[PDB]
Write a protein that binds this DNA or RNA. Sequence first.
RNA 1: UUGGCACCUCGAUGUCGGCUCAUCGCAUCCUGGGGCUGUAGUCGGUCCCAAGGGUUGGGCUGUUCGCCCAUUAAAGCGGUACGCGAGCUGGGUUCAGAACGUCGUGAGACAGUUCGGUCCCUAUCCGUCGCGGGCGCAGGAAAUUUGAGAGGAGCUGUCCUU
RNA 2: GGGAUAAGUGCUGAAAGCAUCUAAGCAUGAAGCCCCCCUCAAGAUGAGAUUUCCCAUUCCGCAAGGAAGUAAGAUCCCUGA
Lengths: 54, 7, 142, 36, 207
Amino acid sequence: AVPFRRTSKMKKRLRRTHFKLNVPGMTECPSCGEMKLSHRVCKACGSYNGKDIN
Amino acid sequence: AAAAAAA
Amino acid sequence: TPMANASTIERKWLVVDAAGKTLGRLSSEVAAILRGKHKPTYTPHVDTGDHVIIINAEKIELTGKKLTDKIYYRHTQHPGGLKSRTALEMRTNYPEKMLELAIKGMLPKGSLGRQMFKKLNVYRGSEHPHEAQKPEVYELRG
Amino acid sequence: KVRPSVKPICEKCKVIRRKGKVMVICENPKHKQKQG
Amino acid sequence: TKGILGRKIGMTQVFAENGDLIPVTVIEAAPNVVLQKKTAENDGYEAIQLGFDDKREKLSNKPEKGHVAKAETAPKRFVKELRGVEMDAYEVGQEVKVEIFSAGEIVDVTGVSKGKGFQGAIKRHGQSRGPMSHGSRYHRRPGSMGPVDPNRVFKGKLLPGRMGGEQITVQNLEIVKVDAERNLLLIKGNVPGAKKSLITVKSAVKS
RNA sequence: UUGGCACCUCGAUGUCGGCUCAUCGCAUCCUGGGGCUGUAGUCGGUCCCAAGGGUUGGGCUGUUCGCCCAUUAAAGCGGUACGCGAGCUGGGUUCAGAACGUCGUGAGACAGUUCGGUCCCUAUCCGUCGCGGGCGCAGGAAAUUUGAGAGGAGCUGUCCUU
RNA sequence: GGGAUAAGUGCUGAAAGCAUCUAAGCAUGAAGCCCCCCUCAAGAUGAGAUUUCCCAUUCCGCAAGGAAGUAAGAUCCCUGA
């Protein structure tokens, strides 16, 4: 449970290839925008298909 | 001897 | 100062018939052809060798009692994975990889060795599908 | 019997060399010897 | 040989001609439409394609719609090959039904087994369990990886992992009853897989 | 196996016996095929070819070993740091306490015996067991597939006819 | 259940006019072997094969090539096993 050798810079950067995170499913809000993530109520106008329900 | 009793 | 060819190599196609020769004596000549030892423009890092086609691989023969005594091993990465067959069974079913194992044994080991293995083409006799390349018949030196 | 000292036991024994192996055959089956 | 492929519904029990009680697996496996005939001069081997459980046009692609246009049928959910059937004996678009199997025959049943998730070595490999008492801190663990001298673990060391989801063939099952009206096959014994999964029933290798 | 030497390790290579997991070699315990028998048949003896598979549940003792009970087709020998403690237990060896016998004036000692006695580690890399993301496979795709190769399985008893 | 086999059992036969399981030619023969039973398998860079869709735009780069939109198709997001 003890590291025998230190990790080099290149192996660390290769391990950090998949550490990035993705862009969310964000789309144009039909009321005002911009923008609104899919299948959630818009935080700006408080509308959802298409009534102001807050 | 060689007793493994390390503390 | 001396010449060293690179991307100017002209590669020819040769047909070698294995009806009466050994496994064996022809395989070293084919490996030397594939390395490019017959050309004066040989450069050891650029693969100046040319293509060769071997036909009648089932007609190969080998002297002595090697038909029952010579054993080919194909050990896996598993314990107890030693699998063995004789030279008669390897010739009777499919002698193509018999000939390619001979050439791979006599070729150098490395990236160029795997590249020069790609120019080899071994077929069961006596026709090859490379008539579009117009290969010439090569006779063995002995 | 398999022994590395294959020898003719009696006068009827005959020494032969089947398959590169020294053997003795005889009319008596007790005298049958092989090596290797 | 002959065979047919379908969906199993569940298990029931049927007594037949005596007092004896038989565990019975119910399979919906009809109709199956011949989609493609593989030939040795073109494909290199002899086989037939069977399609089962046709679906809506919304769930089918344009290549899937064009592939079944030759057989004059709707696109189907399950396509598998049978090899080697008695060539030819079937034309492209002919319906294969459950009447090919009599209710005394011996068949081979194959399918994808039920998934168990990532499981330990005791359940996945049947390995024996360590003591729970007399000071022991050892149970539910796979074991020693091997000797010291190779300086490595040999390939094939049984370790925890995902169990199930693989193809399992159960050999020499017997048909109890065939239902031509409701497209049902009644098979003696247990059949691998979960409910409403794809089950392929082929004739056994006799004898 | 018991030894011999002291080449490697004393700025540490954890040492017995069990548990778990195994793998390999036959100088083969059974099963398979045979030769010779002072083999009438069953059961046997010896020597060949054969590692494919399988080779047990207890009582005693820390014990391996060994003896005994009951089976079995048989309860085979060994190697892998006398396989395996960053996988597990400390019963015995092998700490600090206290006794018995013996030796020693004595402090103390005893492969002589007995009672009791802290077993740490969050896995970096190679290895193994599973599951993904890329790119390639000279256009982009949805399906169905051949098989170069690889893994799994491989054991046998009893009864009736002849 | 097939094929080549080990130990064995042999047939026809000469070196050596005989004899002979062998030096040429044919067999038979084991839970060994290679298949038939099951499973993974074209990253098998040697990247295989069959069926069926989509089509051959625009703008630069005179050649190689590079950007934008899209068809077939797939994904982000959501309901779940």
